């Protein structure tokens, strides 16, 4: 219910896709693993822990999901494009 | 105490052979001429000619 603190600028670029009101950013395997770990102990990834190792990328993901309702984020372990609804829960494919 | 001198490094000074020293040089030699190459063509396999 809170907003994520802004960690200065230098936000990673998000590519607007007006084709489907979507966007695209390449995060990787570390960001997705971090988000999956955060959404396993009952924590939150959208705004909690504003001093994380890769919180800047998570804040960028939160902004991308707020601005675009059907975001297409691609990881690096499998290169899958998880949508906004699939990224909402914080669990991507597998693993505890 | 004759001094060889040099051109004042101005392009006009060297082109005219002017020299602050006693001897005025004949001219600024020759090092060839640079002409811009003609840009290439795309041929006419893209569109039928039909004279």
């Amino acid at each position: 219910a809170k907003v994520a603190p802004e960690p200065e600028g230098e936000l990673p670029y998000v590519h607007p896709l007006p084709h489907r009101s979507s966007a695209y950013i390449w995060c990787g395997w570390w960001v997705m693993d971090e988000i999956q770990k955060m959404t396993e102990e009952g924590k939150d990834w959208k705004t909690d822990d504003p001093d994380s190792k890769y919180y800047l990328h998570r804040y960028t993901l939160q902004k991308m999901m707020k601005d675009y309702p059907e975001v297409d984020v691609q990881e690096s372990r499998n290169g899958y494009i998880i949508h906004k609804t699939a990224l909402e829960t914080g669990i991507i494919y597998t693993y505890p | 105490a004759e001094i060889g001198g040099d051109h004042g490094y101005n392009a006009t000074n060297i082109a005219a052979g002017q020299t602050s020293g006693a001897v005025t040089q004949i001219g600024p030699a020759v090092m060839g001429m640079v002409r811009r190459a003609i840009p290439n063509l795309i041929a006419f396999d893209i569109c039928g000619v039909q004279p």
Partner: protein, 405 residues
């Protein structure tokens, strides 16, 4: 340079009935494509220029001059405005390209109507319809042989005991270091001139819309084309270097990038990745002489680019240049005149030996270096590198700093 202070001519093929004038566009410009309707409809009539708040009516043709790839003639396929808030040249070009992409402002080229063409410059009682003419300019650049010198001035009280206790000479050492230092300083001077004159790479047609426009960092997802691990990431450097070689070919109009000069880190990255077209690979650096002790020249990039190493690199970079088969189309000339004329002597006051070295080389700049100016200044231009004509303007050299190694 057998004779001091040589000169180089340069022929400019410019059109507009004036071989020399203000703002006369060069014809055979590698950057700027020729105005296709210059002999055609552009000679029968003068099209209205395209600028801010120019409401493009349907069916007519507007002339514009892009900062790169020359001048274009656009037919307006539909009525649209040109974003009057865009006044600068860069923003105007961006808005016009945006209109091009949407298809509203298409790009066309046509000839001339036969009725207007058959009667030109006062035929059949007509008036005010001149031809479109051309000509050559031929302006010269002149260089000067700058000098360089050193001295040793070693004592005679020294050599005796130094040879007696060490076995040295005190003369073959000082002379050797003097000559070596002069050669090293000349080489470093020409290398710095290459970096001084190198254009800022990754700016323009080599830019990826989201990149940093001047540096290539592996941590940017756009820069590595969304690469993963090291086999994919290091090949983005190869792709970028190929893009900048083709950009050098476009700007100079002489050929693709022939060589690069890089730092130890960039060369090591290049050597540790399979440069060929074969999946993604990584490992120990083998193909390139990464170190700068055996030699500086460290292999070639697929038999295309000679990869030199600049052993004194400030942060990091690779500079792609050009050197054609001819010695004239190089972009910078190191033209020696006299090389290491040794002099010796001894003042009778103290009899202590003194020796020195003198050399005179002079450095010249290839005409057509800028590739963005269609005409020089005063038609007799200084050929030595300077602020006006060399700094960040040599089209031959493009320098990019690589980050995140």
């Amino acid at each position: 340079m057998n004779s001091p202070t040589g000169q180089v001519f340069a022929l400019r093929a410019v059109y507009g009935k004036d071989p020399v004038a203000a703002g006369a566009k060069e014809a055979f410009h590698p950057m700027y494509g020729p105005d296709a309707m210059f002999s055609g409809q552009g000679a029968a009539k003068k099209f209205p220029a395209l600028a801010a708040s120019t409401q493009t009516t349907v069916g007519d043709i507007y002339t514009h001059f892009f900062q790169e790839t020359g001048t274009v003639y656009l037919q307006a396929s539909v009525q649209v405005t040109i974003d009057a808030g865009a006044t600068d040249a860069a923003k105007l070009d961006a808005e016009i390209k945006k209109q091009m992409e949407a298809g509203a402002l298409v790009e066309i080229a046509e000839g001339m109507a036969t009725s207007i063409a058959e009667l030109q410059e006062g035929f059949n009682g007509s008036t005010d319809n001149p031809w479109n003419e051309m000509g050559f300019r031929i302006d010269k650049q002149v260089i000067e042989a700058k000098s360089r010198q050193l001295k040793a001035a070693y004592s005679i009280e020294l050599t005796q005991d130094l040879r007696a206790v060490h076995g040295m000479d005190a003369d073959a050492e000082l002379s050797g270091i003097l000559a070596t230092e002069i050669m090293l300083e000349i080489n470093r001077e020409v290398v710095d001139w290459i970096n001084y004159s190198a254009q800022v790479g990754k700016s323009g047609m080599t830019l990826t819309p989201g990149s940093k426009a001047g540096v290539f960092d592996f941590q940017d997802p756009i820069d590595i084309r969304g690469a993963r691990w090291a086999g994919e990431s290091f090949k983005a450097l190869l792709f970028q270097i190929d893009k900048e070689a083709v950009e050098i070919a476009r700007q100079t109009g002489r050929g693709e990038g022939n060589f690069i000069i890089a730092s130890r880190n960039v060369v090591n990255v290049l050597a540790s990745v399979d440069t060929g077209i074969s999946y993604a690979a990584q490992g120990l650096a083998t193909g390139f002489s990464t170190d700068t002790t055996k030699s500086v020249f460290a292999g070639v990039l697929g038999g295309k680019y000679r990869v030199y190493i600049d052993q004194y690199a400030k942060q990091d970079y690779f500079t792609v240049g050009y050197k054609g088969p001819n010695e004239m189309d190089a972009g910078i000339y190191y033209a020696p005149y006299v090389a290491l004329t040794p002099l010796r002597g001894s003042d009778p006051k103290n009899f202590q030996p003194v020796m020195g070295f003198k050399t005179r080389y002079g450095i010249g700049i290839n005409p057509f270096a800028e590739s963005a100016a269609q005409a020089p200044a005063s038609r007799i231009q200084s050929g030595m590198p300077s602020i006006l004509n060399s700094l960040g303007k040599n089209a031959y050299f493009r320098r990019v700093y690589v980050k995140g190694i």
